[model samples]
Target chain A: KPRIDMHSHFFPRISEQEAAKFDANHAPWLQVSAKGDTGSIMMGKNNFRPVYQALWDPAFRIEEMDAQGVDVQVTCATPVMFGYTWEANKAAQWAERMNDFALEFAAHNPQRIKVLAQVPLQDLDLACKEASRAVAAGHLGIQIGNHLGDKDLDDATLEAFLTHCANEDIPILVHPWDMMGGQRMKKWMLPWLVAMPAETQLAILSLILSGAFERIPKSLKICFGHGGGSFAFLLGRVDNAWRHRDIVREDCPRPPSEYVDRFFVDSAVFNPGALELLVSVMGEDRVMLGSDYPFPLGEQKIGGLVLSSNLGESAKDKIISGNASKFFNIN
Target chain B: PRIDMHSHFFPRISEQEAAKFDANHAPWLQVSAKGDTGSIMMGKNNFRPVYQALWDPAFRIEEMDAQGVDVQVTCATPVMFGYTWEANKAAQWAERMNDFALEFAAHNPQRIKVLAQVPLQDLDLACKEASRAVAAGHLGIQIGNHLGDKDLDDATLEAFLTHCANEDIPILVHPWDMMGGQRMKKWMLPWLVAMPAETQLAILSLILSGAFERIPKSLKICFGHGGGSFAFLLGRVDNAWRHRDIVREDCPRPPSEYVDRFFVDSAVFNPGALELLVSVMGEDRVMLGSDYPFPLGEQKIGGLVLSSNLGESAKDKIISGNASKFFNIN
Candidate 1:
């Protein structure tokens, strides 16, 4: 059995000449320094963080994965490179560039790597076209931000794109970015700590309450990042409110608890107890191993918790690899 | 062997008493004898409706008997905290509110234990009232999860927490005026989603700000709603602590190191969730809570924990022993 990491990131390095075409004044532009193996990711000249070679170097990543005992990794662009803020035409171009880089990167080690394509979600048609184009080109899935600038996953504009994915059999991974309270919470990294989970939870609730799950076909497979955010732990209150409040229940046909199996989740939640709760809520087959690897928040040793957990070997086998193989269509 | 640690009590205010404060400033009750029900009005806006069980001890006792609960630790409703009010005015209102709560428990002292309400906006007044209430018969104190925009980590709250520690006042941090106010108005998202997130933020705020190291271990504080997803998300925070310098700026140790220092309630409303809570927080730190008289609360009190797959001794401790130790009940 192969241990596949369902949650990992890749960022294509754009050199100075390539980045110079971008508006220097605008935020979210990438800049690779000519001096070192590292570069600066800037939000309009104010450095967001320094990037290391492990983010773009497949060789370094493979070495690290070998040490962690990972047999395969399904890779997607980091949320910062998602480019949700870009105009449609420009965003589509960047999306294709990122997708091509990932495909080429995976060609080096096809047996050990898979890629999830990124799309220009700002434009619905462009998003559909790119997702279809990328999936036809060896990408097994697509990755999207939790929300667009003002549109959540349940927005009317998203129906067509989501329907396309369902019809095409392309899985989706929703990652949190541009957090809701990032501006207000400027201390102690609350943007990542507090608002990140809140953003993911809001996305999940928006889908559940808006009847998107019911309207969308059952063929669409989506897995949320960070153990489905805080949704599993907060499921009871959601169901309780659904039963008691007319507004909460009127839009949705079923209780929120009943929707757990309809979606899949990753096993990036850190604690053994958390993994147990997630499995109990989401069931064994619905969960796959995810590490958010090569990032600070990713597990130090991928699938370490599963190996150390008191869960039986059969269940552990399913979470560590079997579920990922089935979900991603990896044999 | 059952103790309900998460019930709330509301005090009745006569029209004359309510008229003393400006309608726009404070929340007051308007009762209608003919209907046998009343509404909590903030100015002219109706915040929520209430039945007799919210205030009448006789009605509450009858419900408790039918539910098979032996004891309940009663505190004021979260809305009544009035943390946003003017300091002096809020202090005065808190005093009167405590008098009513103290008197309400006087009706059934053995079955009902009172937790006093203090105006957190005023630290001196809050400390004084917490001391006074404990000097009387109150078991401990109940407070909002956050004081205005400040969590328990803010320096202004340090003195009050130290005071609670010195006085041996076990604190109950309940969710009120939850974050993401207007954005979460639809579908009752505030109570269902943001409340737990708020509780989580409070715990992380305390841990990241080093409150556990500063305060004495004697100050027992229990978070409502199974510590609001903190137990489940500890690994994420700990990972950030390990890798990011910004997250480790204030706190010296990882969040997992302080998990056992605090406590959580078993009002999670699921057997699997209860089992997870016990596994993470241990049976001694997990107490039975029912949040009674509210529609979102469990109607059967300790039934969820009692029926879970936990060991006989674990269930017994969660049902009653933990609450007894935390609240100093005999």
Candidate 2:
């Protein structure tokens, strides 16, 4: 079973100097809790992930991937590291160290692992620069969050940056963070369930509705986690808003749903209907198998949902294996 | 061929009538005599342009004609309902507004229909108001997404909803006090973007919170802006219903299981979007609605449905038939 797992996250080990520098900066530093090979990656009060040394060890990640029957795994910094709120330079420092570590790891591990880089999305110039550097250094894409401060994904300042992604033939994988409505949705740990998906859907909608997708190069390959969050299912609502409301119409010539097929989603949908909807909405070629490795919230059984669904075998094969091959251009 | 179901009207009350409520002023921020034609002053904002057509049926009909609409089911503008009012004041205000709306419907029997409002914060008053409005030739009732933090799922509303259903009166659900509008005050984002999201949450609460199950199936309800964001979040909501223990414990069925039970408007504006709405909810569930007098709503009435690649029969259903049956348009 040839497979490319497209949505795993990782945090590489830090050098002593880098660790001291990060600690001295009076910022939220990564505090790891490790005992008997089980640990957690933390930032201040936020527990980013429960981890094993596999998160930092190239050989360990490969072994685990093999255990899951995954032939190749693409890794990015966990969503918490997006650190968009940091001053530009601190974010850039983190970016440089992280992307360099990813590049160095991919170099050492060869075919078993791939990398998607990160940057300070608040500063488009730095983001694009770091994105280009990472791609040139063998990273396949840049990992971004739903928003940077008050600015959303379709913010015009990022137009040049998005165009650069397309021109460079690099994908920007949108993960969710800095969720909206956090203040109002305080019920049921909703920051993860409601706020996160809502934010991702906002990104997809603002981009398409505001004509960022239309203005940018069509070759720009943007993929989203959690099956494009609320996007694939929301085509009707946004499309209706686009069709009916003149207030939001200045940005595009056509309705928002016309661009639904433009982006891709990973098969981290976690259920049969979600997987089917993801496959149908984005088309199977765009629904690559993705799991948030070692996270309970991620798809539990890797390709289980796709494997069990009524989807065509050819489509299942594309989602479970071949799509990631083409998307990440893995040889 | 189009029956617009989501239009709103603001009362053109005499200064004394507006001030009487201003004096009581327990709940809604008092009305201020601002411009020559005063506006409902909700705290700081003057409620803009104070569009004259909101009170003038003739002008609204003219605007509706321009948009190619045949009939409009009208209700008190959402902000005017002010469900936060004291019980007596709210009941009085509901009667005043319903009577005013009934007069408009009686005058323009062919062009306009009435959907009245009740103070949802007061349940007995709400049911009484519903019975009164329905008896007064109003085809349906309008209520906010919440009555101050209480969703449709609130037990206080179940009886009222059941009463409306038993009486064969439909509901036109609207949103007020958007849950997160405070964060988005600039660029009209609060109105255009956040309001749709608020409406979406309202519907989600109805379905996922088990409001639909508790309310009688006979309950006829319609949501503005095409079920707000509910139509778009169906798969996600159903997905969460299946996988999340919190959601699954109460909602025994998939969230999408209730999609067709309520009606939604074509106020979504985009043809492709309209097509998706029709596909998801079925063509029979969509009715023409331009949110009349609001520029953000579909400016061309049947424009999106007719302009779409949807079949002629589908367009016809959206433009008229669905509403004809839902509101029993004569």
Candidate 3:
């Protein structure tokens, strides 16, 4: 059975001239190193992080994947490139540029590489259109930031777009970027560590509390990154709120736990106990192998944790590749 | 043997007492009948309802006896912390609550221990009241996770916490007026989600802001809600600390390294969660908490700990041994 790394990323090598065309304040562009193997991912004027060639070069990525026994890598652009802060149409152009690069990059070896699409979520209509276009152009799914600035996934403006994806049978990958609470949490990368997971949980609860799952077609297959963040562990608390509070139940007719199977999560949680708990809440079949590859916070050993987890071999096989194959519709 | 370290007490108040203050500004209980359940009216809004068990020690002890809970540590319901009120008035209010809590614990001195509430809006006043409360036989201090806009890490709280350390009073940190509560108004998401987030923020601020280092390690602090997602999310916090200089800049050690320094309660509501809590914080650092008498709390006190598959010694530690040490109860 082939193992799939479902949550890896691609960082496009943006030319200075191309970056010059957009508002540098809102755009993410790369600064390639003079030595060619290392670079910085510049978020506007700020240097987000220094990166290596593996983020963009498929050869290096393939080399790393082979070492880790990941047979197929589902690649998407670094979430920083989401560009949700840009003017809608301009953001659409950025999405197209990134999506085009991803397609071409994965085309290097279709058997070994799968790609997800990015859309201008700031504009719902454009988001739906770009998502449809990306899937049409051989992308398996659309990867979106958990929220757009202040507008979370459950914002009333997003219902139509979600409905569109549901109707189109588009697989959605919700990732966390531009996290909240970054201002108060300036130290300790608290934004990435704490705020990122909180953002994912908030998105999950927003959708659940807003009854988005009830309104959208059951066909809408949404998967959250970072093992659905802190949702699995805190599920008992969430359900307790629903059962005791009328306000929580008013938006959704059922408890949040009942909707666990309606969405999917990846196996990126680092600890075996945490993985066991995630599986206990989400079930084995709903989890897939995700590495958040090429990032320091990601699982460096790929599916090693899942493979070595106390979970049975039957469960391990499903998480490593079986679930991703079905969820991504890979042959 | 069981010592439930997490429970709240709502002191009795009359309509006339509420009438003395601005209905718009002060929170007052609207009593339905003497010794019966009533509503807590925040001026025009009905904040929450309260039962006799919240204020009647006899009723609470009866229920405690029925539940087989040996001793329970109590704090003023967080609503009366008055972190946002006028300092002098809030201090007066705090003093009154502390007095009432003392009287309540006096009813069952051996079975009930009181944690004091202070006017945290004014640090000096908070120190004064905490001193008075402790002198008055309050076993420890109970504080909201943050004082208004200031988290526990803020310099504002250092003196008061130092006061606790200097006095050897254990500290109980509870969540109130949770940040981001307004956004999730429909669900009890305020109590359910944002409350835990506030506790997590409190824990992180203490760690990332170097409060944990600056504050003496001798200072004993226990956070409610099993330290509010902190136990489960430590891996992510540690990951960033390992990789990013910015995360590691303030705190010289990884966040996980500081886990043993803090204490947590077993109000986690699930056996697996309690087990994880014990695993992360250790049985010695984890104590039983029921968040008693509230609908959102554990209906059967110490139920999760009783039901969990932790070793008998581990379960014993959680049920009472930890609390005995945490609260210095015999």
Candidate 4:
């Protein structure tokens, strides 16, 4: 059985009228504009045309997935939307609109597209309400940024949403978009080299420290992208800091690794050495396959990568499909 | 047994003179001329006080035997001999430092020793230093970052280092200050964050560029500061490269297999992580490193390595035995 991608993203096709309406009111960072590749606007250093092209063309995605042998892609809104700064009601309306669009996209190809619901976290009540709506509408889980505004994953506002997700037995797919203005953002170094993993580390640290794992128990599963970022290598640092207890005890109740068992990570880290290290740290059962579909950093060929890994076949199978199937309750 | 082939300088007396020169000249970049109480010099990043207090003949002999260190291979002067001169001056100073280090080894007879120094930027000077140092009792050569102020994949460095390898002396690679341009100078984040990535990129560029395979013999290289964070992401890079046909065209070698030939240091600061590193790269490839006397970042030598999760045999190999074998130290 091929693996189910637990971490993937999709951009919804907003009609020109809808785009104009949103642009007039919200002015989202991700605006719908058509420019040739040569004159394309810039997102950091990369061109915006490729980003739009990756979203607009289905054949591009299919070719990528086929090359990588990804069986199903669980899609969510791009992380850029997490920074949307609107009132709760407007944010919720946009989220609902985005969710409806996502559901329609997944429904068109039910076999391949799995949807992770987007919720407007600016308002907790609206977020929880949308959570129920999206789950009921067939999203397997809800996607959230590592940090919402300035608050962390374990902040009080997120707790209510977490409790709801836990009560509903749905995982919260934690994706990282920024490193929160560290030295990483300077000198063309932010997203490509530093922010990707550093943000994941921050989220993981919060989840480990905030006692979220113990409070939620097994009810809520957290999946981190970019191969759990630097955590795969830095778990020793985490565990060491935990053992020292001087730094962590200001907030946390127990050791960090004690909470590690409650989280899940995807194998989107672009190297086998990292794969082996992640396996060593989290073991085969806790990690699942993630293609990060339509993203440049995701694994391009899952079967070949796994088959060639130093891990055993059973572990490889679990990483590829078994864990994801069991985690998502896929039939 | 696990061995850390990438351990760094625990300088002797000569290293102190070099560090004093570094403090006077290369201050504010890597070595600190004025700092807190634990500073390398009175307030500088000198190596003398630390070397005299830590690794003099009697001190190193006892410390090595107690820690089961069979041999300790020194690499580069502390702060790379304060090599902060113009290109020609750098070349001249590097040769002088190499000769000075070789004489230091002559004083120790069979107790302690070192890897030679190179100017790195000037290939002709680097080649001359390598030959002279090796002939004058140095076992191998040390390089600070890539040559010619460019990335490691540059064709000129590939040729120069390949020639050095042909001469049968290994290169000990360490990171140079000021990677990632002027923007990284803001918060020392460039040193902390950019340096490791720079090292990783250089090593990867070398491997992907087929430099590792192109050398006439298996190149014996030691990456200081625990291979500059490459161990943590080695698997990820190798796994990513397998399908990304854009970069790896000439080389068909798997990254993991190629990485095994290179060595890492125990400067990682955490033992459990070291266990994972050993698991991935195996024990024989590791070596003991203290990066001693820098005050802020130096390992506490015996206590640190002894406290590691690695077995005693592995510890012994890392502390000195690996160095002994790699440098053929008696």
Return whichever of 1 and 3 wins on DockQ. 3
Please, what are the lDDT tens digits per residue for candidate 1 over residues B1-330? 678988888887865575575566567777766646888877777788777778888888999899888899999987777787788888888888888888888889899898998988888999999998888889999998566655435776667888999888999988644456345656777776677777888788888878888988887898998988777677788878888888888789888788777889998877777777788788789888988888777867787887889999888888889989999897
lDDT (tens digit, per residue) of candidate 2 on A122-205 = 788898889988888889888888777677766676667778899989988888886666455544334555556666776777
Question: What is the fnat score of candidate 2?
Answer: 0.15
Q: What lDDT score is found at residue B220 in candidate 4?
A: 72
Question: Each candidate's TM vs. the true structure?
Answer: 0.93, 0.74, 0.96, 0.66
Shares of reference contacts reproduced by the candidates, in order, are: 0.57, 0.15, 0.47, 0.17
Task: Encode model 2's per-residue lDDT on B17-101: one tens digit a residue.
Answer: 6567754342122234653344555433455445656776887777777777778888877667766777788788888888888
Q: Which candidate number maximizes lDDT? A: 3
Location of the lowest summed lDDT over 10 successive residues in candidate 2 chain B: B23-32
Quote the lDDT for A113 in model 1. Answer: 85
Each candidate: how many clashes? 0, 7, 1, 21
| Deviating ranges (above 4 Å) for candidate 1 | A25-40, A182-185, A312-314, B148-152, B176-178
* Candidate 2 lDDT score relative to the true structure: 0.72
User: What order do candidates take by TM-score, descending?
Assistant: 3, 1, 2, 4
* Winner on DockQ (3 vs 4): 3
- Which scores better on TM-score, 2 or 3? 3
Model 4: per-residue Cα lDDT over B75-116, one tens digit each: 554454544456676766666666655554555646556677
For candidate 2 chain A, which ten residues in a row score worst on lDDT?
Answer: A23-32
Model 3: lDDT equals 0.83
TM-score of 3: 0.96
Interface RMSD of 3: 2.2
Q: Tell me the fnat of candidate 4.
A: 0.17
